[PDB]
Amino acid sequence: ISRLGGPNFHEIPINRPTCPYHNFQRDGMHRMGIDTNPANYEPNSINDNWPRETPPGPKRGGFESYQERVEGNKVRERSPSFG
Amino acid sequence: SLAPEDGSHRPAAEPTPPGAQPTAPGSLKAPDTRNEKLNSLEDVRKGSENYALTTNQGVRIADDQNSLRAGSRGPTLLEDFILREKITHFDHERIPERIVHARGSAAHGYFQPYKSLSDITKADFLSDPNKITPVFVRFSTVQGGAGSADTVRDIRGFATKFYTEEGIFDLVGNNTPIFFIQDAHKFPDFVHAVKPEPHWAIPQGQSAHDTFWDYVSLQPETLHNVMWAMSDRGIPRSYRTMEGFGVHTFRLINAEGKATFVRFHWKPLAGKASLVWDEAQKLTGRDPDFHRRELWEAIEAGDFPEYELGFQLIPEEDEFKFDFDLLDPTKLIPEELVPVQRVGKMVLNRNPDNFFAENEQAAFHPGHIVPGLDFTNDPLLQGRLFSYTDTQISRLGGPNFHEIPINRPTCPYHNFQRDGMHRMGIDTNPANYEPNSINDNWPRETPPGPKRGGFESYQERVEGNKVRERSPSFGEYYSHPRLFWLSQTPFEQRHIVDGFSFELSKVVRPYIRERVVDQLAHIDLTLAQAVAKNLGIELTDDQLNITPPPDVNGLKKDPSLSLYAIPDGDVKGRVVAILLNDEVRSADLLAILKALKAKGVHAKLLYSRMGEVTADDGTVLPIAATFAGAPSLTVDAVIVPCGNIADIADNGDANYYLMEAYKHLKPIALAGDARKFKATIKIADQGEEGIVEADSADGSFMDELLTLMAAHRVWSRIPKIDKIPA
Amino acid sequence: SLAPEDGSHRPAAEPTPPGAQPTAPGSLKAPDTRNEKLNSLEDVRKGSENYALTTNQGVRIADDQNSLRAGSRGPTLLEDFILREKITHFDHERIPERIVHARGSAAHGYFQPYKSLSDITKADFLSDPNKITPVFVRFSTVQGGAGSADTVRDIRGFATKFYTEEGIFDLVGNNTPIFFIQDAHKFPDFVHAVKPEPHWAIPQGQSAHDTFWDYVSLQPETLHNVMWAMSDRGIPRSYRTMEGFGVHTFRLINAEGKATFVRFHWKPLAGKASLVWDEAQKLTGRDPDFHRRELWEAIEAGDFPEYE
Amino acid sequence: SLAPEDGSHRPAAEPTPPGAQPTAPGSLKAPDTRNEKLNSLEDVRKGSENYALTTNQGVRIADDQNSLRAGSRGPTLLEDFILREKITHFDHERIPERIVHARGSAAHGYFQPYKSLSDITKADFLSDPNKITPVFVRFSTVQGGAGSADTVRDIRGFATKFYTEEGIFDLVGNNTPIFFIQDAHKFPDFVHAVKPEPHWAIPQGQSAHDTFWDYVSLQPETLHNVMWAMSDRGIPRSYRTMEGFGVHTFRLINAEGKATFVRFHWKPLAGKASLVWDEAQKLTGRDPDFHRRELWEAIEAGDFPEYELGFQLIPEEDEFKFDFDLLDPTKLIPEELVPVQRVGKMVLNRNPDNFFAENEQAAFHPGHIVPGLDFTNDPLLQGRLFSYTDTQISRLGGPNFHEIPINRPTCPYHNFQRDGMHRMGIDTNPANYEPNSINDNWPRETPPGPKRGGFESYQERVEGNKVRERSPSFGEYYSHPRLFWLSQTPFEQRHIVDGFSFELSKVVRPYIRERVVDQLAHIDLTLAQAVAKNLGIELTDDQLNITPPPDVNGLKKDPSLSLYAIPDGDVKGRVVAILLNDEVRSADLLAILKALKAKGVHAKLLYSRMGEVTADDGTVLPIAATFAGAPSLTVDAVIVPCGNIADIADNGDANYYLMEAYKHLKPIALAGDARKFKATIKIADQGEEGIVEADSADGSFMDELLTLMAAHRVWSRIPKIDKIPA
Ligand code: HEM
Ligand code: HEM
Ligand code: HEM
């Protein structure tokens, strides 16, 4: 945000993905992409909810975190195993 | 080019009622009003009288009226550094406005608790009834930009910065006890839906448009806070006359380590009061700065905004004892189930000196807590803790925003952070890391303890898998909107129906209207049918047979949810218009002013032109405003004294003044021959509750008007106003 | 699938009168209206239908309704990079507004000269009646912020960007033929006096306050443009029914090197029309977006704003 | 308790010689040193000892070693506001470096004039010999970034901020009297050519690459300042031993309105001294911070940098009396024609406390002038006036950069400018415009006058058409380079030749080397032939026959242009390496050290390991550094006392130490058996000038060494060095 001037640093040509990217994020300093979507939120009816979420799957699926089990109290403490 | 010889350019530095003197920077209006934070800003306050005009480098300017040119009709020269510095500063005056709550009005003040709260919290600012904490408070709307109007229909922000001895605590609340959404991940979606639509950037200051109602119809968790917004809670009369709420459950942590859940409340000691919609919307055009101005003027008059901090406290063992989840910010905790315990009083008693430097640049953030407080896992609060430090990097230009004077703590702050844009503090520590030996490890960490200890988080147990999933206990959306609806008076319910009807009438795509009416049918069929009727929609048989949602832990109503069901009126600081004529009966005006003065109610003297008029006894009356210049929207009641009533009887603006005030349910009082105005608003000879009338203004006449004012508006008149052409 | 099965969510891509259909982005409402600048923006126009929702790094998102947490009632985790990107972007959406003329409404179009003006200027865009120059025009008020109301009493800005074959020419004018002050050194003084007063930031969109009139009373050069602001010129019916002016004398230079002084004018082909004060002031409450709305809807109807 | 029990972590708060104590922030090292600007910064200085570690909001931190997680091996939680504030601040620490002069080193000090100059200037700071003006001075290179090396070949900047009673005056100069180009419109072209080339961003801190020499070969106006850069002026020994110049002709304006043309000079009271190229280049590797370190340590030792301000003055009516245009910043004013008049003394006597807050954030700009000075039409100065205000808007984040503490004036400053990012000052003036009545028009313009008056530009006549045209009077490129060349000693001329030969050998495209050699042939044939020979280029008959340019106003040289033609050496503050052995002769060491002390010369005691060694008589001698760790590059002379020479006799590093120092022309002194080191540097038995040798280190041995040091280097040695493999 300070180094590259704002939240559109992904539109700086070297940082751009080569695959598609579409979402409901808008504006910010030196915004290059001109969105034509009637909607800038979801869920929406006015663009039939596009662009849409994709369930996780074996290929071309949406990101889901691995469901690791977390058990402990909220602490600021170094594991003894690191000592 | 100078001041008038009589000194009338300069306001008296004493308390004065609204309109009596030009308004002024706080430190010039109330130089003797002080607190530790106000004093601390002395290092950066800059005066002006008797000083030479200079460049920002301290060079005196001889001619501030002309650019340097080659001949007096020649081109401007690039070596004019005085012109270029002045115009560079101007060209860079603006900073980004806040992403939400951009429109807001702020003041200084102080807080103190009524008794020590050390049994439930170790927070220092709550530990001693005689230890005062300065505050800075900003009230705001949500949707509109910094230049939008004040009296829109919207939720209002109520953010308080407490400058404590153990750190800054910011209580960043709104004027309703819930929010629209459950999880911070949806915040940009909801905000984008309520904000002006992206193609054309319309509408400003309004949720009355397709995308907002599309989002609501598809996300029923919003319905509770939508019910609040559509009620007269959405259009408060003043920031002094609304409630405040922290929304989330937070924790208090006492010196023995015990956690108690808490929700925070502000109770307005001026009482709860709101406008009516037609008045609010017209006032956005006649005075878009109405709330900002009323707050500043109340403070200049001595009618300081006062609020009582209150806590709803639930023990840790009672977390799951309600029929809603305490961590769900779309649910309120009814006061019938958990009472608000009174904790302390906050008084706002001084306006800022410069709006930009103090109000625009203030940064509030709910993650600024102190020892004795902690967070909970409410998933909206959790995400807020990210946003408020992130957004200041662009809004306030970098990570040193805490050195902007209004944001600075008044307690010590020392650490190993360094640099960043516009770094003010010059660190002399030979170390910029710890642990270090070269400065014997200073500044040092401090263990937690009963007072003056380091912050430690409450060691809540966490057990679950890493999931992006809404808790099933948050999946109920209709019972709290229903409880709110059933707790309103009949006239408040009518105004809620009107608010939804007005808004959905401005949704262009009819299916969205239909979908919202179907949501309403899941809350209350009387509400849904009344909204559907105004929209030309007929409920289906299936919609008529939707089973009402359950009661909330057995409650059918909770009157603390209504603005008006329990009297709590306070007329001090309200304002009455007095419609003058060119020969006012001075004995009427004497009696009116005396009675108003005794209750702290201000008056504005209006006429059909400016300047002065003379009363029957020779008293010269300065005119505050014309009838058109300061419409009835801006006052709480209208009084018309006797005198030469023929002067104003046929004046269209005076007659309209009374018709507008009547429509908007304001008390009207007519003395003597002013009773001929009864004909303009169709009052029967016998009179009407809400219209005070008599041969003269006197003790009885004023006491009656003042009793009406204590009840705020004349709700009984509602059936009589639909026929009035105003 | 949340859209109605009847397709009524989507406005027809044909000219339609105000209020008949929801408004839409221009390239969706009028896809066949083109000019050289609008075509050159194709490289950055982004659609949406039929595409997967992704982060800005192109990673598809599966659940855009929830933060990642340890347990479904647990704390949110710092490793949720999808939440933090979305909220970071949101947190930095705003840029500073313009110091003056922050409230404005804009549209695309084109300009064509009636005849070659090569006798008086070598400007390429005025050289040939068959040469079309795309334009982008922003109309504005002066004092209020970007979220202030349209039908205030104020001067209006009228700014036109001509995308010529020999460079951008911006004709940055107002709706009266003069300005309030004579020398730029005073512009921050004048603007500070008309803008909201610095202690309390009141009033928005209004010159009706003490510091404006204090300055006027002390600087009689301002009286000519104050006369125009006080007239009904200060409350136009629409941006279509006001005049434009460049204010200053500029020069035209021909290929022989002759200079001619010029002042620029725009004449509204819809005619001149203004509101009356009580109506204008009331409309700032009933519809603060009235001029921005009227402009957009006139274009969607085919009532194109035209100016000579 | 992390500091050592003996207090050895803390530097003595008193003057100490380089290496004796760790360095420290200036207000901790020299608490007694003060001036009006250092006193005014006290309000932002932050301490550390005995304070708790806090957030920036003043909340005390209990554990600064761990993030908050769910379990001690679990995920980090978003609610950890302590971790996110500390990482956010760190993440935004950096600001843009200066576009040029990014690498620089600065100190505080003071200036006083010798007598009042009221007869020629009404500038307040020059009006009274008792009036002392604080200064802040930053020295720099031009091309490299902030993290590039100090002892590059480059022009150096010398920028002084005078904090006067009538405004900030910045004298923003370089260490040569001219610049490379004539019109500011070419500055981006010239700076892009010298800067790292845009494909690969190489080379750093070097003009030895194709684009620089491409531009020079096409732009002969650059050749004058290029001659200076190729000379040893390009590689100063210290910021203490270089000249400074304002370059441009400015004006002084007295109280009667009379203008005098002036060029500004700084004369180093330590005298003029430069490195030699192999030494400079090697030092960029062994100590890239050598000049920053030398400056800081001189001030900690009490070897304060001192400079005399001087003025070359020309009356208005003599504007056209020279063979060159006074407005042409590629021409110098020879001192033989217009003498420098001494004006006053500047002493730099306190280092900053925090480099980023005081050095990195300082803004100097030559448009910052005060009444009594004014500009001229020099077209390079005219463009500079635009750039220095503009560039601060991105570098320092906005238009309030004068409120960063180091930049603030110490005199009053009041105006109607408001807002902007980072606004600190909170204006209480009811008005933010003038003329106003509501504040009686304060702050007010001030007419010009003899003292304390408003700034008015001198009413110079302007007559001409609007043109983009260079004055024909600027079109002469070779005479000033030739004057400079002829003014150099023979050894200085040799080092010029070697500078161009080395740089042009790094140019990959041979035709550019050929084109530069052709320009040199228009300056001096001897110069051109000697460079050509080193490049394998043969001059053509046409090049051999170019007529030399004319002399400048009859001068065929001016010795003030040479570094060394006129001895001006001072040994105070120089440093000698003393090479120890494991059994040093203590009588030798005592005599060396006594003599060095008397003249204020420092010593560093070196050996093959750290720790201590013991003298023949039991004295314990602490080792500062090893042979490899503090090489001869870093000292001015080398002395080897007697003792157990066999200990170090076949130590390669010790031998190499003396060869390196011998190559680089440094005085070397050998006592007793240390004379055996004569063989490693091929010295004959009868000895040679520049090598001091004797049976013991006194009688006249230290006087001999000290006289060699006053002459800086042993120039007569130059023939002998080529046969040393070093
Ligand atoms: C209970 C729900 C919330 C309440 C009661 C609330 C309250 C407020 C208030 C009153 C302000 C204005 C403070 C001022 O006067 O400057 C504000 C600003 C802001 N809020 Fe919230 N908020 C809520 C949810 C959120 C969420 C979910 C996010 C995003 C994750 C968010 C991010 C922001 C940001 C970026 C600002 C502007 C802050 C600044 O620039 O200083 N808020 N909020
Ligand atoms: C003939 C008198 C003037 C006219 C007709 C005029 C016209 C305008 C207009 C229409 C705009 C809005 C541009 C847009 O729509 O984006 C504007 C912007 C602006 N003007 Fe002027 N103006 C005048 C005087 C001045 C002066 C005297 C100054 C300062 C020296 C000034 C500085 C600015 C600045 C800083 C902006 C904002 C531009 C931006 O942020 O991109 N103007 N002007
Ligand atoms: C006689 C010719 C010049 C001299 C002697 C000179 C001197 C200097 C010096 C000594 C510095 C470093 C100041 C510091 O330590 O912060 C500097 C910085 C700078 N100069 Fe110049 N300069 C010359 C020409 C120019 C020109 C022609 C321009 C552009 C028109 C320019 C623009 C700048 C800029 C942008 C900086 C960095 C300033 C900052 O970031 O605050 N200079 N100059």
The set of residues, in sequence order, having a beta carbon less than 8 Å from that of C282 and lying 6+ positions away, is: B282, B285, B286
Please report all neighbours of B, defined by 3+ CB atom pairs within 8 A. A, C, D
d(CA B472, CA B668): 54
d(CA B157, CA B174): 4
Asked if D72 lies within 8 A of A74 by C-beta distance, the reply is: no
Instruction: Determine the 3-state secondary structure of B135 from DSSP.
Output: strand
Instruction: Determine the 3-state secondary structure of B723 from DSSP.
Output: coil
What is the signed CA dihedral for C269, C272, C278, C284, rounded to 10 degrees?
40
Domain boundary among D572, D594, D628: D572
Tokens of residue B31, six digits:
């130089």
Domain boundary among B521, B554, B572: B572
Asked if D390 lies within 8 A of B75 by C-beta distance, the reply is: no
d(CA A53, CA A67): 19
Which of D686, D13, D33, D493 shows the shortest CA–CA distance to D304? D33
**Which of A45, A66, A69 is facing B218, going by the closest CB pair?**
A45
Q: Which of A2, A29, A65 is best to mutate for the D interface (most D CBs within 10 A)?
A: A2
Q: Are D500 and D510 found together in one domain?
A: yes
Q: What phi and psi values does residue B284 have, to the nearest 5 degrees? A: -60, -25
Q: Are B565 and B590 found together in one domain?
A: no
**Which of A1, A3, A79 is facing D72, going by the closest CB pair?**
A79
**Which of B189, B199, B461 is facing A38, going by the closest CB pair?**
B199
Asked if D79 lies within 8 A of C74 by C-beta distance, the reply is: no
Which of A47, A44, A11 shows the shortest CA–CA distance to A29? A11
Tokens of residue B382, six digits:
């959790």
The set of residues, in sequence order, having a beta carbon less than 8 Å from that of D556 and lying 6+ positions away, is: D483, D486
Q: Is C183 on the interface with A (CB under 8 A)?
A: no
Data resolution in angstroms: 1.5
Asked if B466 lies within 8 A of A68 by C-beta distance, the reply is: yes
Q: What phi and psi values does residue B664 have, to the nearest 5 degrees? A: -90, 15
Which of B171, D494, B292, D82 shows the shortest CA–CA distance to C203? B292
Asked if D75 lies within 8 A of C76 by C-beta distance, the reply is: no
d(CA D228, CA D154): 9
Distance B414 CA to ligand 2 centre (A): 45
Ligand 1 pocket residue status of B387, Cβ below 6 Å: yes
Asked if C292 lies within 8 A of B470 by C-beta distance, the reply is: no
- Sort out which chain A residues have CB atoms less than 8 A from C82's CB and list them: 63
Ligand 1 pocket residue status of B383, Cβ below 6 Å: yes
d(CA B216, CA B308): 33
The set of residues, in sequence order, having a beta carbon less than 8 Å from that of B18 and lying 6+ positions away, is: B294, B297, B298, B300, B301, B575, B602, B604
Using H for helix, E for strand and C for coil, what is the string for chain C?
CCCCCCCCCCCCCCCCCCCCCCCCCHHHHCCCCCCHHHHHHHHHEECCCCCECECCCCCEECCCCCCCEECCCCCEECCCHHHHHHHHHHHCCCCCCCCCCCCEEEEEEEECCCCCCCCCCCCHHHCCCCCCEEEEEEEEECCCCCCCCCCCCCCEEEEEEEEECCEEEEEEEECCCCCCCCCHHHHHHHHHHHCCECCCCECCCCCCCHHHHHHHHHCHHHHHHHHHHHCHHHCECCHHHCCEECCCCEEEECCCCCEEEECCEECECCCCCECCHHHHHHHHHHCCCHHHHHHHHHHHHCCCCCEC
Q: Which of C72, C99, C143, C213 is best to mutate for the B interface (most B CBs within 10 A)?
A: C72
What is the signed CA dihedral for B232, B233, B234, B235, rounded to 10 degrees?
60
Among residues 449-478 of chain D, which lie with CB inside 8 Å of chain B? 452-457, 462, 466
Which of C147, C132, C166, C291 shows the shortest CA–CA distance to C205? C147
- Sort out which chain C residues have CB atoms less than 8 A from B469's CB and list them: 63, 66, 69, 72
d(CA B652, CA B658): 10
DSSP structure class, residue D191: H
Instruction: Classify residue B448: in a domain, yes or no.
Output: no
In this structure, the number of other CB atoms found within 10 A of the CB of residue D658 comes to 26
Instruction: Classify residue B423: in a domain, yes or no.
Output: no
Residue D717 Cα distances to D663, D664, D691, angstroms: 8, 9, 10
Kindly report the nearest CA distance between residue C238 and chain B, in angstroms. 16
Residue D316 · residue D278 · CB < 8 Å: no
Asked if D78 lies within 8 A of C76 by C-beta distance, the reply is: yes
Chain D residue nearest residue B464, CA to CA: D70
d(CA D122, CA D315): 16
Beta strands in D32-117 (DSSP E): 45-46, 69-70, 104-113
d(CA B348, CA B362): 16
Instruction: Determine the 3-state secondary structure of B189 from DSSP.
Output: helix
d(CA D414, CA D442): 9
Q: Are D478 and D577 found together in one domain?
A: no
Ligand 1 pocket residue status of B100, Cβ below 6 Å: yes
- Kindly tell me the sign of the dihedral angle through the C-alpha atoms of B142, B145, B147, B153: negative
Beta bridge partners of B52: D444
* Cβ burial, residue D1 (10 Å; 0-12/13-18/19+): exposed
Instruction: Classify residue C6: in a domain, yes or no.
Output: no
Tokens of residue B189, six digits:
């979606």
Is the bond into B203 cis (omega within 30 degrees of 0)? Answer: yes
Q: Are B205 and B108 found together in one domain?
A: yes
Instruction: Classify residue D438: in a domain, yes or no.
Output: no
**DSSP structure string for D323-372:** SS-TT-TTS---TTTSPEEEEEEEEEEE--S-IIIIIIT----TT---TT
d(CA B532, CA B518): 9
d(CA B356, CA B404): 12
DSSP structure class, residue B461: E
Q: Are B186 and B224 found together in one domain?
A: yes
Kindly report the nearest CA distance between residue D96 and chain A, in angstroms. 9
Instruction: Classify residue C17: in a domain, yes or no.
Output: no
CATH number for D496: 1.20.1370.20
Q: Is D443 on the interface with B (CB under 8 A)?
A: yes
Domain boundary among B546, B572, B598: B572
Kindly report the nearest CA distance between residue D89 and chain C, in angstroms. 16
CATH number for B642: 3.40.50.880
* C-alpha radius of gyration, chain B, whole number: 28
Instruction: Determine the 3-state secondary structure of B544 from DSSP.
Output: helix
Ligand 1 pocket residue status of B401, Cβ below 6 Å: no
Burial track D361-394 (b if 16+ CB lie within 10 A, e otherwise): bbbbbbbbbbbbbbbbebbbbbbbbebbbebbbe
- Return the residue whose CA atom lies nearest to atom 39 of ligand 2: C98
Residue B472 Cα distances to B287, B328, B475, B586, D175, angstroms: 46, 11, 5, 70, 74
Beta strands in D468-574 (DSSP E): none
**Which of C86, C204, C218 is facing B1, going by the closest CB pair?**
C218
Which of B204, B267, B278 shows the shortest CA–CA distance to B235? B278
Q: Which of B385, B426, B456 is best to mutate for the D interface (most D CBs within 10 A)?
A: B426
Which of D127, D131, D136 shows the shortest CA–CA distance to D163? D136
d(CA B614, CA C212): 30
Q: Are D544 and D579 found together in one domain?
A: no
CATH number for C77: 2.40.180.10
Residue D126 · residue D116 · CB < 8 Å: yes
Beta bridge partners of D104: D140
Residue D137 · residue D158 · CB < 8 Å: yes
Name the residue type at position B691. I
Q: Which helix (H) or strand (E) holds D308?
A: strand D306-315
Q: Are B592 and B555 found together in one domain?
A: no
* Cβ burial, residue B546 (10 Å; 0-12/13-18/19+): middle
Q: How was this structure determined?
A: X-ray
d(CA B579, CA B585): 12
In this structure, the number of other CB atoms found within 10 A of the CB of residue C267 comes to 12
Name the residue type at position D157. G
Instruction: Determine the 3-state secondary structure of D231 from DSSP.
Output: coil
| Chain position carrying tokens 């695309």 | C108
In this structure, the residues whose C-beta lies within 6 A of any atom of ligand 2 are B 87, 91; C 98-101, 104, 138, 140, 157, 159, 172-174, 179, 184, 187, 247-248
Residue D306 · residue D269 · CB < 8 Å: yes
Q: Are D498 and D488 found together in one domain?
A: yes
Beta bridge partners of B159: B138, B172
Instruction: Determine the 3-state secondary structure of B200 from DSSP.
Output: coil
Q: Are D186 and D146 found together in one domain?
A: yes
Residue C223 · residue C181 · CB < 8 Å: no
Instruction: Classify residue B435: in a domain, yes or no.
Output: no
Ligand 1 pocket residue status of B608, Cβ below 6 Å: no
Instruction: Determine the 3-state secondary structure of D160 from DSSP.
Output: strand
d(CA B229, CA A18): 44
Which of C10, D430, C108, D715 shows the shortest CA–CA distance to A44? C10
- Give how many domains chain C has, as a whole number: 1
Instruction: Determine the 3-state secondary structure of B236 from DSSP.
Output: strand
**Which of B75, B382, B398 is facing D92, going by the closest CB pair?**
B398
Q: Is C218 on the interface with D (CB under 8 A)?
A: yes
Distance B472 CA to ligand 1 centre (A): 26
Distance B110 CA to ligand 2 centre (A): 43
d(CA B284, CA B205): 10
Q: Is C210 on the interface with D (CB under 8 A)?
A: yes
Number of CB pairs < 8 Å for A and B?
Answer: 84
Instruction: Determine the 3-state secondary structure of D120 from DSSP.
Output: coil
- Sort out which chain C residues have CB atoms less than 8 A from A24's CB and list them: 53
Q: Compute CA C261 distance to the chain's CA centroid, rounded to the nearest angstrom.
A: 29
d(CA D378, CA D376): 6
Q: Are B657 and B609 found together in one domain?
A: yes
Q: Which helix (H) or strand (E) holds D593?
A: helix D586-599
Instruction: Classify residue C15: in a domain, yes or no.
Output: no
Residue B709 · residue B636 · CB < 8 Å: yes
Q: Which ligand approaches the C-alpha of residue C188 most closely?
A: 2
d(CA D534, CA D530): 7
Q: Is C76 on the interface with D (CB under 8 A)?
A: yes
Q: Are B231 and B293 found together in one domain?
A: yes
Name the residue type at position C59. V
- Sort out which chain D residues have CB atoms less than 8 A from B4's CB and list them: 437
Asked if B85 lies within 8 A of D428 by C-beta distance, the reply is: no
Instruction: Classify residue D219: in a domain, yes or no.
Output: yes
Q: What phi and psi values does residue C140 have, to the nearest 5 degrees? A: -155, 170
Q: Are D131 and D70 found together in one domain?
A: yes
In which domain, by residue range, is B478 found? Answer: 469-572
